[PDB]
């Protein structure tokens, strides 16, 4: 499986990079694992969007 899951991660990196998402490699792997657990995606969409506003008021 392991080579195929490496390939599917790479293709998943490319299609989120040309769509110009603010995420990176590591946070993609985190979100992929969170959905691989069975966690509702509709809830993760809230925490990424509220983090990506709330972290800038700190800096």
């Amino acid at each position: 499986n392991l080579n195929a899951v490496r390939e599917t991660m790479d293709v998943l990196l490319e299609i989120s990079r040309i769509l110009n998402t603010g995420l990176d490699m590591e946070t993609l792997s985190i979100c992929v694992r969170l959905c691989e657990q069975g966690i509702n995606p509709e809830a993760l969409s809230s925490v990424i969007k509220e983090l990506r506003k709330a972290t800038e008021a700190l800096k």
Binding site: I18, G22, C35, S45, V47
Partner: protein
């Protein structure tokens, strides 16, 4: 573990050079918004729907790239339903368009003259980058030429 996976999400999306209590408080908001949702058509089709909106705005081979990559991405479906929600929100050359003098098997279609005027806008964009830069050098100093002593400088604050 999952109590760390929201915290590692919290660290990577926070840059650096308070902000040492904020990480630990923002994983609290991460759990507090996890359970606001939990208390209260395939996956590939949404990607086909965004590629269509690429094709209407021009840029055809790009939409064809999206779809050739999601056809092999069928071999993750719970990741794409998240990916489509962050594909609209962002952060807060080739010579073969108009050349026939190469190859031997090269098309005959003759002239274009329907976007060859938008082949000169191709150059207008390049000169419009290097003229917006010289507009962003003259303003950042014209905000300095009109100022007052120690209004933005904390050196008078000593």
């Amino acid at each position: 573990s999952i109590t760390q996976l929201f915290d590692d999400l919290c660290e990577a999306l926070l840059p650096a050079a308070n902000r040492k209590r904020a990480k630990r408080s923002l994983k609290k908001v991460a759990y507090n918004a996890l359970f606001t949702n939990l208390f209260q058509l395939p996956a590939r089709n949404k990607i086909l729907m965004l590629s269509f909106d690429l094709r209407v705005g021009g840029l055809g081979p790009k939409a064809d790239r999206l779809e050739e990559l999601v056809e092999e991405l069928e071999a993750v479906g719970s990741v794409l339903d998240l990916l489509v929600q962050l594909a609209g929100s962002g952060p807060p050359r080739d010579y073969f368009l108009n050349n026939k003098h190469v190859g031997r098997n090269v098309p005959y279609s003759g002239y274009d003259c329907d976007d060859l005027s938008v082949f000169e806008m191709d150059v207008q964009s390049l000169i419009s980058r290097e003229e917006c830069l010289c507009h962003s050098m003259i303003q950042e100093t014209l905000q300095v030429m009109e100022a007052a002593p120690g209004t933005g400088l904390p050196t008078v604050g000593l």
